[PDB]
Symmetry: C3
């Protein structure tokens, strides 16, 4: 078995909905990256890549690589998973912690787990997603952005 | 085996001692929200539940449900642990990282480990608890709150 | 197998370079502690000690004790690893997440991996190091300090 950790942060900016764990949530602010800014999926991708000793999202999808520029986070996840599986890895389980003061993540989590399990080719039970606030403290608590932590266990 | 990740934050507020890992530690301020404010045990709870894909502490014990209203974090842990064991899981080991500038945790950690080991029905050697400051940086470093990280490895 | 989690933050201060994963990186600022301030190696050390249930880089090396005074983080890592192996543990794998806006960690990562692999006496494929920004948010995003998350898996 192999352990991986991922951490990601995206700042608010613009309007439109945000996308967390592949799920569109309505919010007064959008998430500025060039990513879609799926904090949950990027942190998960890093947790998975890190468990496979394949580096991170940046190493696999560099700015000077036209293939995945403008691709959504799920596409990046599936590709990362593809290269992880090519190395001989199977999915143990994943656990994702969304750190956000707002919006409320809870009702949207079931569909995140569905989306993640589809992309990783696994069951509901292998994917856990949870949310928490920083009790109005820090940059997350001041509503400046959303953080996310993810761990992943892989089998070879 | 299965991994989970817990992360909790509680702001400083009021008087009395703080409760960390079941241990009441003398401090100038208390810890606020809901239950006794045990960031250590809530994060530990979330990590264990996250490993069992049972969501989080807030999912088992919602705001609305009066059943768990007024219960301390050790009671919440033992109940969460009961739900986890009812799913067929046993404990591999746990690691808790208390993120606080003060107060000093180090004298109280041996006692934290004892309480946790009893609540999870495991050996002391299966329980690790540690502390780190953020070197006066962030909300923890400014003494605004205590963060807590936790990881758990379950067996099935 | 046993899980471990490490976390560390160090504030910027003085002149460069900074040392991250045993690698001196040119930067406008340095890192304050009376260590070399290696957040990566301290978080890794804590992750490993945590997995072994040996406490932390503080219980093992007291600030009061002048025995390990002036020691660099690689020496502390190797000593921690010696004591961990003395408990009968070997290395599964490690994953390290440097949380920093700057400097760019990417061209120094392979070196960190090599140093960590030599210090832990393991294969390079057993060591993963990654870096992430906080999108200019928090103390890391403002260039006040550097955080690091680490996870370890040990075998007995
Ligand atoms: N101190 C640092 C911080 C980061 N890095 C490298 O830059 C890369 C990008 O850093 P980031 O800004 O923290 O991560 P990212 O989420 O990529 O932020 C940019 C917006 O997101 C993306 O555009 C994106 C997301 C997933 C995959 C590819 C992407 N380009 C990291 O993956 C890492 O390899 C580095 O070398 N040194
Ligand atoms: N962005 C977010 C942030 C949080 N949440 C949900 O709200 C819950 C509480 O969020 P929090 O405000 O960050 O947690 P905290 O105050 O630390 O409280 C822990 C939750 O446990 C309880 O609610 C509880 C504890 C003891 C007795 C009764 C309780 N209801 C989370 O567990 C999560 O399910 C969410 O859905 N989206
Ligand atoms: N709330 C807390 C926070 C930390 N601690 C203990 O302090 C120790 C150190 O915590 P820290 O100060 O946050 O981490 P560290 O990176 O070790 O601090 C700076 C390192 O530079 C040094 O000062 C140093 C390091 C090694 C040997 C001598 C040194 N002077 C922890 O391992 C823990 O045992 C604690 O008991 N309670
Ligand atoms: C999500 C993680 C890894 C939390 C632990 C690190 C920490 C205590 C950051 C402080 O918050 P902050 O940087 O938001 O404080 P501020 O922005 O107020 O300086
Ligand atoms: Zn991202
Ligand atoms: Zn809590
Ligand atoms: Zn340190």
């Amino acid at each position: 078995m192999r352990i991986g950790h991922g951490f990601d942060v995206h700042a608010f900016g613009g309007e439109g909905p945000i996308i967390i764990g592949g799920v569109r949530i309505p919010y007064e602010k959008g998430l500025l990256a060039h990513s879609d800014g799926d904090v949950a999926l990027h942190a998960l991708t890093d947790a998975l890549l890190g468990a496979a000793a394949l580096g991170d999202i940046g190493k696999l999808f560099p700015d000077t690589d036209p293939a995945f520029k403008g691709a959504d986070s799920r596409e990046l996840l599936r590709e990362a998973w593809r290269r992880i599986q090519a190395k001989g890895y199977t999915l143990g389980n994943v656990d994702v912690t969304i750190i956000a003061q707002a919006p409320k993540m809870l009702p949207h989590i079931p569909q995140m787990r569905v989306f993640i399990a589809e992309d990783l080719g696994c069951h509901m039970d292998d994917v856990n997603v949870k949310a928490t606030t920083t009790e109005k403290l820090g940059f997350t608590g001041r509503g400046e952005g959303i953080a996310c932590e993810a761990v992943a266990l892989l089998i070879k």
